[PDB]
Every structure is written in C-alpha cells, then in structure tokens.
Design a protein around this nucleic acid. Structure first.
Length: 610
RNA sequence: CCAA
C-alpha cells in the first residue's frame, strides 16, 4: 500500500489514491492508513453514506460536547442519541485506533422500521441499506436532515430535557404562501438544516462567477411561484442566525460543472447579521452596515462526493480543528479508514471534476475555538452496575462497597448469534460479510475476597431482528431470546447492557478472558490494552491459539465435558486461568510449562476425551 | 487457526 495517502495528484483529472475504494477489511492492519491521533471508521457497514456524516459532526465542538455529555444520565430510550454518544466517546478515546459504527447502524435500522405525515423520510433511508450504484443523488442530504431531526426529537426526551441542539441548528423559517390578494398564510417551523435545492434564478454568478454566499442568501429568503391547478406563490424567509449552519447542496450537473471554475467559491469564513426582513452575508466587515449584533462564521467541515475513475461513488469528509495550545487550524480529510492531514489551499479547492460538495457545515467564530470536553469532565451515573433492570419476568448483584475502581479485576465473556452470512459477490469485488449480533454477556467478580469467582451480571440481550443461526453449541442461547418468550434468563435491552461494559472501562477496570479482542469488536467498544488480560495472548504458541477447554484439561483438573456452552462458566474458568498464569509467573516456570503443552499436544493431537 |  505504498503511496496511498497522497491526497494530491499533479493532474487535475486523476483521482489520488487517498479517495479510491479502500480494500475490504484475518487481522487487518490499519497502521499504513492513519498517522494522526484521530480515528477512522470501519467500512464494513450497510450504509454507503453514513460514515462521512458521523465524522462531520464529531468535530463540531458544541454538538460533540453535548451528545457525549448526554452520557452522564441513563438515556436508554434515546437510542440514536446515546449510541451516537457511545460512538463519539469511543472515537475520541481511541486516538487513531479503528472504530466501528455497527451499534449506531443497528439503532438506525431498527428505528427506520416504523410500519407525522412525512413518514417516507423513514422509508427513503431504509431503502438505502440493502445496497446497482453505491449511493444515489440527494441521499446524503436527506440523511443529514433526517439525522438532525431525529436527534432533536430525542433531545426533548432525555433526562432533564434539553434544547441545546435547537439553539445550535434552529432556523426559524417563516413560510408565507399567498393564496389571494391582500390575504396570505404564514407557517413558522424550526428547521435543523438549510436545503439549497431547486435553484431557478441563477443571477448569483455575476457580481455577488461569484462565491457561495449568494446561494446561502437565496435559501434564507426566496420567493417560489410553483404549486398545484393553483400555482401558488410561496415566500420562505428565516430570521435566525444560529451557532451552526447545516447546508445541503443539491444542484444541477450544469450548475455543478459551472461552479468548479469559480475559484475560492466555497468561502473559508465570512460575517453577517440581519438588517432587513432578509439576511445579508458579506466577506469583510467593511461591507456590513452594522446597526445590529454582528455574527462571525467560520467553516467547520463539509462532506464531498468522490466519483472514482472506475465510475465508483463514495463520500469523504474534510474537517478543521483548533488547538488551544496555539492559534492554528489543522485540516483533516476522512476516507473510510484513510485519515490524512492536508493544507487549506487543497481542502477549499474544488476545481477537480471528481469532487462535488454535498453537505457543508459552518460554525460560529468564538464557539469553534472552544475545546472538546471528554465525558469524564462531569459526574457520571454508575447506578446500572447495581440496579436490576430487566424486561422479562445463579448470580448476585453488586453493592456500593464493591464500587469498582481503577484496577478492579473482572472476568467477561460474551455469546453471539448470526443474523446473516457472508453474502459475497464475484473474485470478490462488491459485497462483504456482515450481521453478527450480541446475545448474552456475563461479568464475574475477579477481585480476591469473599465474593471471588461469583458473577454479578448474567444479562441476555433482546433482539427482534431475524436471525440465521443461533450457534447454540458455542453460544448456549436456547431460542428464548425473544422479549416475551424468555425461557429462564432475565432479558435486557442492548443499550442497558452496553452501559454496564462502558462504565466498567470508564472507571478503568481490568478485564480478563479468552479472545477479548473479538468480543469488544462485536460488542462495539474499544478497551485499551492495559485493561485487557487475554489468556490467548499469554498462552500464545507462535501464530496458533489454544482452545480454552484444552487449557482447562492440561493446565487444570477441570474436564468440562463441553456440551452446550455456558458463558457464566466460561468466564469463571478464564478468571482462574489468569490466576494460575500469575502463579506460574511469580515462580520462574513461565517458559517451561508453555513448552510442555506444545509437545504433549503433538501426540494428543490437541484434544482430550470429553 | 482462535473466537463463535
């Protein structure tokens, strides 16, 4: 993959490798694709267009500090809001490590299955999951308006209901539709984004061609004269300059081709206020008449559509970030997992024909220079680690004297199920394997004491989606995972069980188990290597890993006689194995019994009668 | 292969 992060091409037509279709993601190496301390997203997703938008909103300080801040309280009902907060917090703390948005994608697919007048907004987003072209037109802008609308709707349903997202994106739109003479009707609705679509009077590129500001002025105050056998006159006007401006560019290809020639069209920064019943936007303050509270706006980021030379379509994200240790603006470009730091002259330049701006974001001046606040800047509510929150009808819950600290030993094991299969297209060129879901996890008390080796959660994860295979032999999940059909296990949602794991790694607990990197990858949570004690890495044999049942029969006297797997018992045996490994390490017998399990396994064929 |  040499010469793949080059974002510039000497030719104005050849698309550089930084925007090409990245190779599909046993252990994929991401070190030659990201050198910065800001993470990328796993391209193995059902949505061809949501990864670019998530990165666009991560670097808006006023939104990022809020949705991450919403992780103080247990907002289990706001699925799309908290899952976005779980993703934003994970992205910030990974500092470059790969991240997956499968949890957010699952909450979006379950929310869009809703079967308000504009309900086709749900169906238009659901129609873009089964993947034909990669992404259609006007579809990224449709989700941009959909994501912001659903977030605000969930923002009013959180604990201590907030309106912070409305104060940032709120566009007080006056919709005057004149039916007859001297008699008109006005509508006032708060819009999260501004839609620049269906432009008719292209009088902008003469002397106001020109820059982007005239397009924003028309979308803020326009008079359309088309409706129906009526052809009514409609006048849309906004009287609000919010903190951030969400722009949705959807123009004609003739207007898109003419807009590439105008150098410096997409303006870096501008200022403007409201003087008349319309909004005026000027480059410098010398053109501003003043007489009102002036507002300064700077570009935060934008999502552009890349048309490959192989006639392939994909989205990328340009991003600016401010460092409080100096006065500097660093640009960042985001492919799926390709992240590079670029210059401003290249980020604003759009003379290339394979580049089309789709979603632009402008931010307030004094608010962009504000630093990003992590979730651990407030007091988080660790009440779920003790409460019994089940959705149905041999462990023991936790107490406040067992309050986990930075270093509390815990044994974790997770069971999963199969929703779909590989479902590939072919040499493989289009499709990828997907759809593995979580069924049951269990955390065990690992701290030495009276309550040692005894679990404290045994939660099963409810799932309404159609499964393809239970993997019952390796999952121990009888068909009782249905919400009203719980056989014997106490069920729980996915948002509640994820918070138990998130709070454990938030405090700094130390997880032990076998193959913990797999569970955390499918649970969709990233834990630092300092808090992971994997028995596979410890008892590693070159490139071969040993089965947990085998180690229980060669390192201990526990012949499990494995029939139906049992996660609560699997995590228990993984805990005491870490205790034996500690014993065999304190006394210098480390690389003496490890060599004993290789050779004894050659004649035994890595198996024992069970 | 491990994980499942």
């Amino acid at each position: 993959t040499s010469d793949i992060q080059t974002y510039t091409s000497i030719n104005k037509y050849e698309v550089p490798p930084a925007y090409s279709r990245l190779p599909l993601t046993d252990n994929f190496d991401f070190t030659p694709f990201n050198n910065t301390e800001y993470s990328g997203l796993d391209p193995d997703v059902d949505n061809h267009y949501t990864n670019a938008i998530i990165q666009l909103y991560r670097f808006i300080p006023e939104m990022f500090n809020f949705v991450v801040g919403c992780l103080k309280d247990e907002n289990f009902e706001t699925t799309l809001l908290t899952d976005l907060g779980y993703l934003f917090d994970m992205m910030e703390r990974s500092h470059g490590k790969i991240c997956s948005s499968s949890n957010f994608q699952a909450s979006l697919k379950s929310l869009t299955d809703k079967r308000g007048e504009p309900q086709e907004h749900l169906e238009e987003y659901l129609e873009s999951l089964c993947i034909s072209e990669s992404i259609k037109r006007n579809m990224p802008q449709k989700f941009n308006r959909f994501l912001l609308s659903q977030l605000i709707k969930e923002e009013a349903q959180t604990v201590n209901h907030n309106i912070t997202l409305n104060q940032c994106f709120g566009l007080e739109t006056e919709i005057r539709t004149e039916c007859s003479c001297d008699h008109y009707d006005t509508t006032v609705k708060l819009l999260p984004s501004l839609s620049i679509s269906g432009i008719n009077k292209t009088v902008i590129k003469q002397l106001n061609g020109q820059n982007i500001l005239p397009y924003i002025e028309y979308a803020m105050k326009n008079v359309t004269q088309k409706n129906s056998t009526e052809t009514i006159t409609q006048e849309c006007t906004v009287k609000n300059l919010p903190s951030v401006l969400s722009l949705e560019l959807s123009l004609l290809d003739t207007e898109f081709s003419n807009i590439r020639s105008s150098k410096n069209w997409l303006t870096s920064e501008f200022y403007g206020s409201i003087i008349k019943n319309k909004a005026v936007l000027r480059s410098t303050a010398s053109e501003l008449k003043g007489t009102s509270h002036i507002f300064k706006y700077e570009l935060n980021g934008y999502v552009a559509k890349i048309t490959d030379n192989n006639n392939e379509t994909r989205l990328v994200t340009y991003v600016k970030k401010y460092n409080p240790k100096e006065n500097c603006f660093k640009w960042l470009m985001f492919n799926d997992y390709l992240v590079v730091e670029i210059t401003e002259e290249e980020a604003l330049k759009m003379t290339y024909p394979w580049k089309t701006p789709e979603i632009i974001i402008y931010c307030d001046a004094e608010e962009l220079r504000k630093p990003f606040f992590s979730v651990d800047t407030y007091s988080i509510n660790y009440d779920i680690l003790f409460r019994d929150y089940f959705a149905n009808g041999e462990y023991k819950l936790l107490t406040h004297d067992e309050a986990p600290k930075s270093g509390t030993l815990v044994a974790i094991d997770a069971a999963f199920v199969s929703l779909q299969s590989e479902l590939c297209e072919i040499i493989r060129s289009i499709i990828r394997p997907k759809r593995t879901a979580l069924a049951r996890i269990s955390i065990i008390r690992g701290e030495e004491g009276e309550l040692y080796g005894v679990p404290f959660v045994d939660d099963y994860v409810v799932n309404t989606n159609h499964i393809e295979d239970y993997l019952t032999r390796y999952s121990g999940i009888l068909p009782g995972d249905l919400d009203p059909e719980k056989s014997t296990k106490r069920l729980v949602r996915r948002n509640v069980v994820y918070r138990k794991v998130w709070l454990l790694m938030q405090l700094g607990c130390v997880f032990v188990g076998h193959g913990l990197n797999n569970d955390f990858k499918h649970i969709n949570i990233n834990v630092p290597r300092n808090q992971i004690r994997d028995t596979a890495i410890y008892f590693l044999q070159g490139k071969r890993y040993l089965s947990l049942r085998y180690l229980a029969y060669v390192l201990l006297g526990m012949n499990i006689q494995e029939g139906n797997h049992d996660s609560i018992e699997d995590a228990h045996t993984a805990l005491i194995l870490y205790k034996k490994y500690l014993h065999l390490k304190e006394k210098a017998i480390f690389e003496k019994v490890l060599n004993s399990v290789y050779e004894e396994g050659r004649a035994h064929n890595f198996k024992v009668p069970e």
